[model samples]
Target: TQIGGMSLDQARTQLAPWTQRAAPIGADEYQQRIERARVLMRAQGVDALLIGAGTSLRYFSGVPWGASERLVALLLTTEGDPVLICPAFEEGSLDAVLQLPVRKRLWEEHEDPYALVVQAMDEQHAHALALDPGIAFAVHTGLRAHLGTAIRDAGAIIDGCRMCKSPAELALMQQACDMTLLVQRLAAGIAHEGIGTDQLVRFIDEAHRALGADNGSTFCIVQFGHATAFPHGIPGVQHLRAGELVLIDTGCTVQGYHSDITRTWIYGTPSDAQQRIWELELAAQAAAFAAVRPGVACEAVDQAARAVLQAAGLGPDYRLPGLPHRTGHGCGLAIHEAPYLVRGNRQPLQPGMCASNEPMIVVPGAFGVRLEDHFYVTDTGAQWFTPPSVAIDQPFA
Candidate 1:
C-alpha cells in the first residue's frame, strides 16, 4: 500500500480518538512547589522571591494572569504563606481561582504596585530579593528603582525546581507527546501527490483536535521540496510532487504542558541523496539521545550529534549542509526552557529533565531531513516519550 494515501475527509474520519485523560496537577503539588522554592531561597540566603504573571507564577503560585502595565506579583517569603500584590479590581476574581487562601494586598488604579511589593518585602525583613528570571524588563526596571536593594537573578531557584519533572508532570507530557506522535504518523499516511502544504497543515491541526487537544495545535511547520532546506519554511505555498521532500513539525498542549515533534521524509520514492542524508540525520539523533546519561553535560550531547555529522564532513559546527541550530532544547511548562542542548552549556543531565534530540541536516538547494523526538533523563538514563520514525519506507512504528 502507498504511504500518504488518504485525503482530508478520509483522514479526519480515520483519526484516532484521545484515550489519555490528563491528570490535573493538584493542590498538594503546588504546596510542595512553594516549599521547594523556599528551600532554594534559604540556601541562597535570599529573604523573599518575587514572581509576576507568567509561567513561573503558575508553577509557583497557581496564578495564571496576563502581564500588563499593572504589576500583579506573587510574594513568597522564606518561611511564610505567599501574598499577592494584585490590582484592586482583580482581587475578587483572583480570590475565586486561588489554590489556597492567603493574604492579598490590593493597590488602587492610581497606586503604584511597586510600592506595595517593596512594602511586603520590607515587612518580611528581607535583605535580599530574588526576582523571577522571566520577569519582563519593564517590570524589573520599575521594581529595581524601588526600596529593594539586593536584587538577584532567580534562575537557580526557578529552574532548580522546574527542570526536574515529577512523575505527574511526566505522565501529562507523555500523553501529549503520544497524541502528536499518532497525528504525525497519520499525517504521513495522508500526504499524496498534488497536495498543498496549506491543506496538510489544516488537516494536521484538525488531527490534533480530534486527538483531544481542544485548542488544536500549539505550533506547526510544513515544508515541501526546496522549501524544506530553509529549516523553517518560505511564506508562500508549496505543493507535494512525486519525489520531493516533506517536513512536518507540530505539537499540541495538554494541561499547559506541550508536545513537540518533527518528522521529515520524501513524499514519494527516496533518492540516493535523500536516503543518505536521512540516515545521517537518524544517526545524529541517536547519538544525541545516547549521550543523555546522568552527569553528562548537555553540550556534550549536542557535541555527540555534531561529531557524527562532522566525521561525515558535513560540518565542524553551524556551517552549511549541517545543523544550523542547537541539537535540542530543554522542554517542560515552556516549550523551550533551561539546560539547553547546545555547545558551551555545562549543565549536567538530571533525571526528570526532558529535551529534544533533533539534529537537522539541511542540504542547501536540495532538501532537509529533521527527525525530532523528545527524551527524558531518567534514573535509567534517556527514555523516548515516543518511538522515533521506523524507517524511510516504514515511517511509523
Candidate 2:
C-alpha cells in the first residue's frame, strides 16, 4: 500500500541516497566567478560582499544547500581567502562542496550566528560590503548594527556578475532546457482522455528523474479544461478529456542550473477562442524575442509583448485571461533572476544573459495559455537555448 502516495519501503529507498552522487560546481569556474565579483567590488570601492541565501552564494562558492535559521554567509574579499561563517553542524557539508579557498568559522546553533558574522566581517577588514536584498530582515539588522552604514545592498553588482554566462554555465543551462523539453514531450504523449492531473504530474516527475534532472524545480502547474484559466492551478485528481485546454509549466535543474518552460495544448482539436488566444500569445512571444538584442532596455521586450496583446483587444494585464506577470525574467542558478522583462527596468541586455519569455494569459475559470522558452543574448543577436514552442497543439513533440 502506498503511504503518502508512496509505499513505505519505496519512499525510504528513494530518499536513502539523495546525496550519494551529488555534483558540485567546477573549481575553475567557481574561481572565475569569484574573481569577477572581486573586480567589481574593487571598482565600486566596496571592501567585501556579504553573500547570504539565494543565487549569489551559489554562484560564487558552489554551496547548493538550502538556507535555514543557521547563518551560512560567504564574505568575499578582493584579496586572500574568502570567509565562510556557518553553524558548526553545516561546516562538513560546506567543506565538501566548496572548492574556493576559505577560512571557515563554526558556531553552535544556540549561539548567535550574527555575532560571529560581525566578528568575521571585522577580521576580514570589511569597512564597506555588499549584501543581497533577500537576506532576512533580522540578519540585515544585525549586520547593520555591527557593520554600520557601510553595508549597501549590492544586488545590482551581483546581477552584473551573473549577467555574463560562462561556457560551462551555458552548457549546463542548455542541458536543463533539453531535459525540460524531454519532459514536455513525455507529458504530451500521456495526455490523452482520462489522464488524471495527479497522474500527469507523476508522469512528469518520473520523466524528470529518469532523465537525471534534480526533481521538478520547486513546483509544477498542470491544468485541464476550464481549469487552465488559473495561471497557477492546483493539480488534483481531475482528468483530461477531449477538446479540453491543457496547460503545463514545469522545469528542472542540471548541476544547479535551472530551466523553465510552459506549453498549452488541446487534447483533440482547438476551439476558435483557443486558436485566437494561441496566435496572439505566439505573436507576443515573437515580438519579445525580436526585442532581445543587446543595448536595448530589458523593459522594451515587455512593451513589445504587451503591445501585441493590447492590440489584440486584451487588457494591459492580459495575463488574467490576458497577460499576467512580466514577459520574462533572467534564468540561471535560480529560475528567476535579474534583468526582468517588466516596465521601468532600464538595464540593457548583454551577451551571455539568459531569460524566460513566458507571456501568459489566464481567463479566470475559463482557460489560460502560456508559451514559455529560454533565450541567451548573443554578441550580435539573441539565441534560444530552448527554441520557442512553434505549435500550440503539439508544443512538446
- Report lDDT (Cα) of residue 390, candidate 2: 63
TM-score of predicted structure 2: 0.89
lDDT of each: 0.85, 0.78
RMSD (CA, Å), each prediction: 1.8, 5.4
Q: Write down the TM-score for model 1.
A: 0.95
lDDT tens per residue, model 2, 142-191: 77666665677888779878977887788888887887776776677656
Native-referenced Cα lDDT, model 2:
0.78
Candidate 1, 262-373: lDDT as tens digits:
9887777889999999989989999899888899999999999999999999988999899999999988877899879999999999999999988999988888999999
Worst 10 residues of 1 by lDDT: 1-10
Best-matching candidate per lDDT: 1
N/CA/C clash count, model 2: 9
Q: What is the Å distance of residue 233 in model 1 from its true position? A: 2.5
Reference-based TM-score of each model: 0.95, 0.89
